[PDB]
Write a protein that holds these residues in place. Structure first.
Motif, mmCIF file in Angstrom:
data_model
loop_
_atom_site.group_PDB
_atom_site.id
_atom_site.type_symbol
_atom_site.label_atom_id
_atom_site.label_comp_id
_atom_site.label_asym_id
_atom_site.label_seq_id
_atom_site.Cartn_x
_atom_site.Cartn_y
_atom_site.Cartn_z
ATOM 1 N N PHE A 35 18.429 17.853 75.142
ATOM 2 C CA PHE A 35 17.562 17.205 74.642
ATOM 3 C C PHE A 35 17.375 16.015 75.647
ATOM 4 O O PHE A 35 16.513 15.387 75.292
ATOM 5 C CB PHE A 35 18.008 16.574 73.365
ATOM 6 C CG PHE A 35 18.030 17.881 72.361
ATOM 7 C CD1 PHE A 35 16.787 18.503 71.887
ATOM 8 C CD2 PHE A 35 19.207 17.886 71.472
ATOM 9 C CE1 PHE A 35 17.049 19.251 71.189
ATOM 10 C CE2 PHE A 35 19.118 18.730 70.438
ATOM 11 C CZ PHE A 35 17.867 19.702 70.298
ATOM 12 N N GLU A 51 19.492 25.551 68.702
ATOM 13 C CA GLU A 51 18.505 26.678 68.293
ATOM 14 C C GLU A 51 18.275 26.581 66.532
ATOM 15 O O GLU A 51 17.043 26.507 66.577
ATOM 16 C CB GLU A 51 19.369 28.050 68.062
ATOM 17 C CG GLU A 51 19.338 29.057 67.119
ATOM 18 C CD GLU A 51 20.334 29.940 67.048
ATOM 19 O OE1 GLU A 51 20.296 31.109 67.906
ATOM 20 O OE2 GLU A 51 21.466 30.045 66.152
ATOM 21 N N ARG A 73 15.526 23.395 67.243
ATOM 22 C CA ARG A 73 14.455 23.705 67.884
ATOM 23 C C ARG A 73 13.364 24.602 66.944
ATOM 24 O O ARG A 73 12.374 24.575 66.848
ATOM 25 C CB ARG A 73 14.527 24.485 69.268
ATOM 26 C CG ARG A 73 15.192 23.486 70.246
ATOM 27 C CD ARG A 73 14.845 24.173 71.801
ATOM 28 N NE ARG A 73 16.129 24.172 72.745
ATOM 29 C CZ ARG A 73 16.025 23.782 73.849
ATOM 30 N NH1 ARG A 73 15.319 22.806 74.367
ATOM 31 N NH2 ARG A 73 17.226 23.927 74.538
ATOM 32 N N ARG A 133 11.605 21.909 65.101
ATOM 33 C CA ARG A 133 10.704 20.912 65.855
ATOM 34 C C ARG A 133 9.795 21.569 66.628
ATOM 35 O O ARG A 133 8.791 22.334 65.947
ATOM 36 C CB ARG A 133 11.734 20.366 66.760
ATOM 37 C CG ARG A 133 11.953 19.229 66.709
ATOM 38 C CD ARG A 133 12.597 18.326 65.251
ATOM 39 N NE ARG A 133 12.841 16.879 65.545
ATOM 40 C CZ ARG A 133 12.641 15.912 64.636
ATOM 41 N NH1 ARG A 133 11.964 16.144 63.287
ATOM 42 N NH2 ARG A 133 12.878 14.753 64.944
ATOM 43 N N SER A 153 8.243 23.060 70.780
ATOM 44 C CA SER A 153 8.789 23.943 72.413
ATOM 45 C C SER A 153 8.029 23.213 73.520
ATOM 46 O O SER A 153 8.581 23.385 74.283
ATOM 47 C CB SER A 153 7.863 25.298 72.089
ATOM 48 O OG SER A 153 8.295 26.389 71.151
#
Length: 197
Positions: A47, A189, A192, A195, A197
């Motif tokens: 991040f 995992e 994401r 959220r 890509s």
């Protein structure tokens, strides 16, 4: 490193999108414990520092051994601070995804706080890795009142807390490996997953 107060000193004008709240185990220092700095880092690599808040439970949480034997893993004052850190994270940064992790009594604690959290806030903890879950038996492997598919209980065989007792044994400290692998992986995992890509 071992003390991390990202939420506590966090300014909402500049909120991170991902917020990690970790509960260290018994006897350790700072608020991060031995395994926390590892996760923090793997999370940060994924991040960028700017994108995630690492906050450990300090305050009323003492990591005191005797407390490992209190009715639900730890003490009321612990469950309280963790719960307040969840609210604070929620209130300070509403649109932010949350991850919570815990080792030993830290995990006894993390289940306790999440088990009596306001469901709506609880709704936004995308994943929770527990290490050497001292309540691994009693809660049948889950964090009572959390989605099972979000719980990753690293209970290494040979570790007796996972099996129903306070008997600390060798395997209970064989967690550095997982804290730099399957643990933050599971989290990145899961985040994401909720959220982009």
């Amino acid at each position: 490193r071992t003390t991390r107060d990202d939420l506590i000193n966090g300014n909402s004008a500049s909120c991170a999108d991902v917020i990690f709240i970790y509960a260290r185990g018994s006897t350790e220092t700072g608020n991060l414990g031995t395994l926390g700095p590892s996760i923090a880092s793997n999370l940060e690599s994924a991040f960028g520092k700017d994108g995630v808040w690492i906050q450990g439970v300090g305050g009323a949480y003492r990591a005191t051994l005797g407390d490992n034997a209190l009715p639900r893993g730890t003490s009321s004052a612990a469950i309280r601070e963790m719960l307040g850190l969840f609210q604070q994270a929620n209130t300070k940064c509403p649109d932010a995804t949350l991850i919570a992790g815990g080792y030993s009594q830290g995990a006894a604690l993390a289940a306790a706080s999440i088990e009596d959290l306001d469901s709506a806030i609880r709704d936004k903890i995308a994943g929770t890795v527990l290490f050497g879950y001292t309540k691994n038996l009693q809660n049948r492997g889950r964090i009572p009142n959390y989605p099972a598919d979000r719980t990753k209980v690293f209970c290494k065989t040979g570790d007796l807390v996972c099996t129903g007792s306070l008997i600390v044994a060798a395997p209970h400290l064989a967690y550095g490996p997982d804290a730099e692998g399957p643990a933050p992986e599971f989290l990145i995992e899961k985040v994401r997953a909720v959220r982009g890509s």
